[PDB]
Amino acid sequence: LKTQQEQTQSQLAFLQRKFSNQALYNWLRGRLAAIYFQFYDLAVARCLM
Amino acid sequence: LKTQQEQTQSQLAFLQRKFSNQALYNWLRGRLAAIYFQFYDLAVARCLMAEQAYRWELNDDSARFIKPGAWQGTYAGLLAGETLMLSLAQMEDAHLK
Amino acid sequence: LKTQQEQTQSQLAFLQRKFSNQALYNWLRGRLAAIYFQFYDLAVARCLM
Amino acid sequence: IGYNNQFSGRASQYVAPGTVSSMFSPAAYLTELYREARNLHASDSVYYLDTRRPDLK
Amino acid sequence: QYLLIDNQVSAAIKTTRIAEAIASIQLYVNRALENVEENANSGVISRQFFIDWDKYNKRYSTWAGVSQLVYYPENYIDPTMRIGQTKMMDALLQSVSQSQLNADTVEDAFMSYLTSFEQVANLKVISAYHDNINNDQGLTYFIGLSETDAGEYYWRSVDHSKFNDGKFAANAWSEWHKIDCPINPYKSTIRPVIYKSRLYLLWLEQKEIDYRYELKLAHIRYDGTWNTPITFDVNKKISELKLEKNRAPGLYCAGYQGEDTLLVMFYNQQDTLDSYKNASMQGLYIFADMASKDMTPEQSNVYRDNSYQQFDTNNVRRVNNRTDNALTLHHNENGAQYMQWQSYRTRLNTLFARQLVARATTGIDTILSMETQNIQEPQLGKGFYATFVIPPYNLSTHGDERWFKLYIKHVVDNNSHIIYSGQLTDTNINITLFIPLDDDYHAKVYMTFKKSPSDGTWWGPHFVRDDKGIVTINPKSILTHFESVNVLNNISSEPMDFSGANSLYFWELFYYTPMLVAQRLLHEQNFDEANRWLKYVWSPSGYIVHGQIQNYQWNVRPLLEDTSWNSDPLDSVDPDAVAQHDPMHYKVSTFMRTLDLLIARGDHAYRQLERDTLNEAKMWYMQALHLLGDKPYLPLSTTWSDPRLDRAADILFLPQINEVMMNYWQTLAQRVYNLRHNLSIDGQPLYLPIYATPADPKALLSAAVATSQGGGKLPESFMSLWRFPHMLENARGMVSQLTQFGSTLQNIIERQDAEALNALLQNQAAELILTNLSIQDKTIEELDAE
Amino acid sequence: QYLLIDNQVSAAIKTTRIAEAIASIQLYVNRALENVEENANSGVISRQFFIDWDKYNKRYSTWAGVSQLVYYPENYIDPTMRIGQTKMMDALLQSVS
Amino acid sequence: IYATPADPKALLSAAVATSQGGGKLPESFMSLWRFPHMLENARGMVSQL
Amino acid sequence: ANRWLKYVWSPSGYIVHGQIQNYQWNVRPLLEDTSWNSDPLDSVDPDA
Amino acid sequence: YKSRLYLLWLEQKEIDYRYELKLAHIRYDGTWN
């Protein structure tokens, strides 16, 4: 069972190492969100155009 | 239970045989990554080309849009395409006005 | 086992906090549904055009 | 309150743009250019600027 | 090539006498730089003038251009485009960008900028290394460490090209950059060095097993990620030195000028620098490829002779580089860290970051108040706080033509040591300063009046330390010139100094950002909002703050002081740094942004081509003029001594007239002239209806309901140029792009919550396997009981 | 600024007597609002007339326009476009839409 | 003989662009193409990217 | 780019980890030879 | 206050009966700080 805990924490460690982890998606939502809203300011400008 | 171990290792063996396995995706990320970055060198070239053409149509060279750096080394440069695509959007706007 | 219940309810709580939860999709189906039907009124107009 | 009441009195007298006395006039880029560049080589060494062309002095 | 002039050119090429002189020197310089000419002084090629030789100084067109860019930062610097903005500002522009711009969104922005900035602000500073062979130029680098158990050693560059008089420009400082690789140096031995023109830092960490001696060196990858370090074996080298437990082996990392050979030097720290000379010292060479070559006592000695006084005695530290006293970190009991080479002291830590965040968390108007800026910081080392009051005239009633400077000496007249410099006045201008005390007499103030300074032997106001809590003036000579020189006792602190090292974040937070939102608002055309946002900075009528009223019109303090155009407009070709170091330029920049708000409203009402609105345009244009006031008459003046260039090499040419600011006057005159003569915005004449036809009943209405629902987002001077079918294909394409961003973002979010789910699960899995484990233990215990 | 009329204008500008009276008062009002004139009554600047000074009352064209928009709501008001519809109505138009 | 100094500002934007990152500078250019076309072309490029 | 060719050929030679050395070609095969051979090989490979 | 809607409610968390207040305001979206 201590092997089972070992495994759990090696998995949970792989979650914080792997490139695609949560930290990324936070970053990528931040940046993509800014690009999205801004692009909405533009697109509504041209709509009103 | 030794049958259960047998099964585990036949599965784990099927993971290393199947075409779509990890080895592939390593390969395919390598190649696709190179194609992606390089294509970013090109696309930012043409972005600065449009900006150039615009600082010439409109008179001023001060106008500066495509922003370095839009390529993040970490995060594998993801969302580079859209950050440029924003820049060109803005630059088409500043043109039209 | 009361820890297990604790965990269940922290998960079930994370389901009601997370941005992508059910409440959203209800909202987003409502709005997207209206945009979809209306856009069908238009598109069938131009088809008959 | 005006521009003149504050923000005013730097530099005393000002010069017209084309003049050889401007800060931006080529006698300057010449000037600071030389004050920076006279010292690159030892007073002995032949590359020494004032030994080459004594008249820039 | 020798005589630096073509004797082969076509005789039809006409060129000026000093133009050809220019091309001569430029050829010379270029050849020293490509280095075709054998031995060129490496102290002078390292000067700042040639580090800009490539981008700027090598052409009359650019050098002139960038020289104007500097001499009038008022015309050019932009809160949008400026050299050297911290990352935190980047994340800030992102966080505000991602939603519509207005107060609250900017509140959140600031709470983030500060909740991050608190991590860094006060940061224990360990080691330092200087680059250029001289202290007037080149870069200094530091090493910080996190207060927290997690080390997170941080490093921060700084420039002395931006150091003019006793003040860095506050933009010469980088932000602290986190080091990825966690490490455990022994004591303070971790030291940076510039090597192969790249930042290295070496930390000897000795893994015990008899106490080991080895070191580890590592360097930087363009992204800042660090490469894995490299080992050398100093067991024999350091072992030769006497130790006790006070051992903090001397690490002197010296960069050779060329060929890329690093000089590491091991000494024992001796209490004095003087008799220290000829003491034993050990060194090792590190060549381009990594090799350790131990140094011979004769070599080590010859490197000592010019090396010593760059490394330091007990309890204090100096800086290394390729007066020459190096510079000295000091961390005092009041908890304020700083750097000193010349008697200059510069605070590199600020302690109120926590207070600053707290005050910010309430509201936007809490953090940007004047009173947020008056929160004091502990003083720099020792030192004597005082205030000086002087009449503007000397030597005569008319006195000097323009300005003064005021100095201070030291033991056996080390240097005059500028502290403050100032101008003619009407008023006597009580001014307050800090006087450093480092230890007959203690301090004395020389003042240079630019024509007839007294400068008498002794003379000066005298200040006397050593009375243990009391320092008073015994003039004993002068003060005939100085009205009142007033010590202020019981002031150990100063309102946060924007000459300090974290001053940059303070310019970003107090000054640039409101400018950023008044720009990003004015672009949008909602004027009263933008106006308010500049009123966070400058307003006539001053401020009525939480009650009565206060006199100052500039909400940002550095702007509120100064008011004196400095004599030297710095150096270093940074349109930013030539402000900050001279906040007048930001006062006049703020002024110009104001006039751009009034001229802005004045056009937008002018272009309405509706009589009433042309009158509105005229009240705004009048209001611009009344703001500017009288166009000053600047007496273009030719009196020229025709100097032999030799003389002009004395460390004088007169400034230019500054068009653009005048361009405001003559453009106001132009607009107005066009109003009075009914000529519209260009000269193109108009015939307007006296009583303009009322707008559509309905158009007003749809406008209004659109206002109620949301946003301004209104096209202002438009209808653009394009026909509907094309403008609609273009807009439509735009939207289709926007929808792709939509989808890909939705996918980001589904995917994000999915992630945090997976993580949260694993965390729960641990939390349970603990309890189940303990059960299993106890059932083993029940097997014991059975 | 004090007498609220230009004495510098071209003599070729023809304007009505009360039209120029209008421009006078409009200049006065505007100056109370940008507040270049020291103490302006804060009870009256708070009146409704000046809360619409910006969008409506500051021009004969609009003030007339919007005054007609009001005096005959019969011609203009639309169940589609009207100021101040509750959210519930929004969700309603959505659900029926 | 004395070339006109470059724009005060153009130098500046150039510089800040240098600080932030990359050279990536067009060197002999302005190319041959008008903005509307060079922008449709660049845009297409990015959509690929 | 210049530096990158200086990994191969430079005038003034190289100052390596101290004093200075005479060879101007950092790549050794280049440093020897210096003699155009009699036979320019064969096999039509511009590389070989 | 500051041309923006605030509402202040003094809620006194007992432990002798406390007196304190709490004030909060509005963000353009209506979400409250």
mmCIF file of C-alpha atoms in Angstrom, chain C residues 3-4 6-8 10-11 14-15 18-21 24-25 28 39 46, chain E residues 728 732 746 749-750 753-754 756-757 760-761 763-768 771:
data_model
loop_
_atom_site.group_PDB
_atom_site.id
_atom_site.type_symbol
_atom_site.label_atom_id
_atom_site.label_comp_id
_atom_site.label_asym_id
_atom_site.label_seq_id
_atom_site.Cartn_x
_atom_site.Cartn_y
_atom_site.Cartn_z
ATOM 1 C CA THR C 3 -13.159 11.607 4.451
ATOM 2 C CA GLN C 4 -14.522 9.845 1.397
ATOM 3 C CA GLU C 6 -15.838 14.955 2.261
ATOM 4 C CA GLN C 7 -13.996 14.296 -0.980
ATOM 5 C CA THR C 8 -17.179 13.519 -2.883
ATOM 6 C CA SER C 10 -15.562 18.785 -2.568
ATOM 7 C CA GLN C 11 -15.636 17.361 -6.057
ATOM 8 C CA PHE C 14 -15.889 21.949 -7.751
ATOM 9 C CA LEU C 15 -18.524 20.980 -10.308
ATOM 10 C CA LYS C 18 -15.780 25.608 -12.259
ATOM 11 C CA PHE C 19 -16.379 28.038 -15.088
ATOM 12 C CA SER C 20 -17.380 25.372 -17.620
ATOM 13 C CA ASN C 21 -20.167 23.935 -15.472
ATOM 14 C CA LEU C 24 -22.969 27.863 -18.473
ATOM 15 C CA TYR C 25 -23.953 25.303 -21.073
ATOM 16 C CA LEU C 28 -24.906 28.998 -24.010
ATOM 17 C CA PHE C 39 -30.061 32.510 -38.715
ATOM 18 C CA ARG C 46 -31.929 33.883 -49.157
ATOM 19 C CA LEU E 728 -19.591 43.856 -45.255
ATOM 20 C CA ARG E 732 -17.860 39.380 -42.075
ATOM 21 C CA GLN E 746 -14.065 27.433 -25.284
ATOM 22 C CA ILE E 749 -11.718 26.299 -20.878
ATOM 23 C CA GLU E 750 -13.309 22.875 -21.108
ATOM 24 C CA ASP E 753 -11.409 22.604 -15.866
ATOM 25 C CA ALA E 754 -10.863 19.055 -17.050
ATOM 26 C CA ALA E 756 -7.889 20.866 -12.599
ATOM 27 C CA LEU E 757 -10.301 18.013 -12.113
ATOM 28 C CA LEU E 760 -7.879 17.620 -7.676
ATOM 29 C CA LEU E 761 -8.617 13.924 -7.974
ATOM 30 C CA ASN E 763 -4.769 15.115 -4.480
ATOM 31 C CA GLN E 764 -7.831 13.396 -3.043
ATOM 32 C CA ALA E 765 -6.334 10.002 -3.833
ATOM 33 C CA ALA E 766 -3.344 10.801 -1.661
ATOM 34 C CA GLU E 767 -5.560 12.211 1.090
ATOM 35 C CA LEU E 768 -7.410 8.908 1.241
ATOM 36 C CA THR E 771 -6.093 7.042 6.136
#
